[PDB]
Amino acid sequence: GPVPSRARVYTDVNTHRPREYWDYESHVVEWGNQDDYQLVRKLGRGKYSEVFEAINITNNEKVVVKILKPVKKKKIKREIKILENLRGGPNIITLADIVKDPVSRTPALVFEHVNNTDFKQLYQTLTDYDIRFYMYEILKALDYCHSMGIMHRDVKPHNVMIDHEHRKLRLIDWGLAEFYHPGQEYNVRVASRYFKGPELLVDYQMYDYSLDMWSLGCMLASMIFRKEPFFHGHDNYDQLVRIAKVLGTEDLYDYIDKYNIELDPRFNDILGRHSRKRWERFVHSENQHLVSPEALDFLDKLLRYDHQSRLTAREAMEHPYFYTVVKD
Numbered sequence: 423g424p425v426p427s428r429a430r431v432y433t434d435v436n437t438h439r440p441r442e443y444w445d446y447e448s449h450v451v452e453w454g455n456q457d458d459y460q461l462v463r464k465l466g467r468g469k470y471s472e473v474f475e476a477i478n479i480t481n482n483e484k485v486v487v488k489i490l491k492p493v494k495k496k497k498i499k500r501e502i503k504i505l506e507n508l509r510g511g512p513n514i515i516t517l518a519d520i521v522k523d524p525v526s527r528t529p530a531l532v533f534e535h536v537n538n539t540d541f542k543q544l545y546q547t548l549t550d551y552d553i554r555f556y557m558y559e560i561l562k563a564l565d566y567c568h569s570m571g572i573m574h575r576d577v578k579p580h581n582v583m584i585d586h587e588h589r590k591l592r593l594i595d596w597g598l599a600e601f602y603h604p605g606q607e608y609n610v611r612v613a614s615r616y617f618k619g620p621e622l623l624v625d626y627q628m629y630d631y632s633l634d635m636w637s638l639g640c641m642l643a644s645m646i647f648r649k650e651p652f653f654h655g656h657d658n659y660d661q662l663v664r665i666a667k668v669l670g671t672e673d674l675y676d677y678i679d680k681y682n683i684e685l686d687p688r689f690n691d692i693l694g695r696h697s698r699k700r701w702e703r704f705v706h707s708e709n710q711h712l713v714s715p716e717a718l719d720f721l722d723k724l725l726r727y728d729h730q731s732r733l734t735a736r737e738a739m740e741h742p743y744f745y746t747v748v749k750d
């Protein structure tokens with residue numbers, strides 16, 4: 423059937439790690455004291471959790487409480503194990519506690535609070551300098567988790583929490599994250615539509631860390647071009663069409679041919695024939711101050727159909743685009 427694929431970096435990180443590192447099913451949760459925390463206000467709801475601002479009454483620190491509710495139960499232990507594995511890594515949200523909520527009777531994850539600037543407001547506002555700075559900060563998080571054998575699989579603006587005042591950034595919501603095992607087939611139903619990689623959209627299951635690099639590319643494109651989202655599909659099929667209208671259909675066919683992937687025949691009537699566009703197409707008087715040759719070359723190396731051809735997180739940090747950024 424399909425041609426197999428392996429990550430070109432950190433391929434065997436988990437194979438050379440003890441069972442207990444990646445065997446999240448066997449992880450035993452360590453419970454804290456739910457009475458330490460007092461819920462203050464509801465911040466949001468997702469498909470698998472309700473999120474509250476709270477106070478840790480033992481130290482008076484503001485905190486965030488994520489009360490879980492998933493239908494697949496092993497997912498709870500997956501997120502917990504991932505968070506524990508990545509704790510203290512650069513720009514990774516810190517899991518501060520795990521408590522049993524008395525009302526839901528489910529695990530509640532307690533994180534450090536981030537005084538956040540809304541991305542709707544914060545994008546279309548960032549300077550060229552600030553875009554490069556924050557991209558480098560996100561890359562620190564991704565190289566860290568990739569190096570630890572973990573793919574995020576839901577990189578998007580909402581999951582990048584920015585305290586713009588202290589110029590602080592954290593990658594959050596590791597509930598879709600998975601351990602990368604070479605040759606493993608994964609669920610293509612991950613990530614949010616506008617940020618789904620071509621691999622997901624063509625049903626290619628043997629994907630890897632490089633999925634997050636496509637998502638990051640979608641974020642970068644939306645920032646430098648001031649078009650939110652950059653690839654604006656009406657559904658998952660139209661999502662691939664929107665991509666092909668930019669990257670072209672010939673490189674798409676080359677990609678699926680390389681892996682002996684067959685497109686859903688549904689595309690016969692909607693995909694059409696599209697040339698690759700030059701990135702200057704998307705530059706105009708209102709975004710030109712955010713665009714540079716370095717920015718375009720960097721973006722070009724992220725937004726590639728072939729997941730194997732994308733810059734890795736580590737390579738991306740090497741890019742000329744980041745030369746202007748002061749290295750702490």
Ligand SMILES: Cc1c2c(c(C)c3c1[nH]c1ccc(O)cc13)C(=O)N=CC2
Nearest residue numbers: 465466467473486533534535536594595
């Ligand atoms: C999953 C999730 C959501 C929200 C927030 C603030 C957080 C969140 N995880 C977090 C982790 C730390 C934090 O400071 C805030 C959030 C949120 O505001 N709305 C939906 C989901």
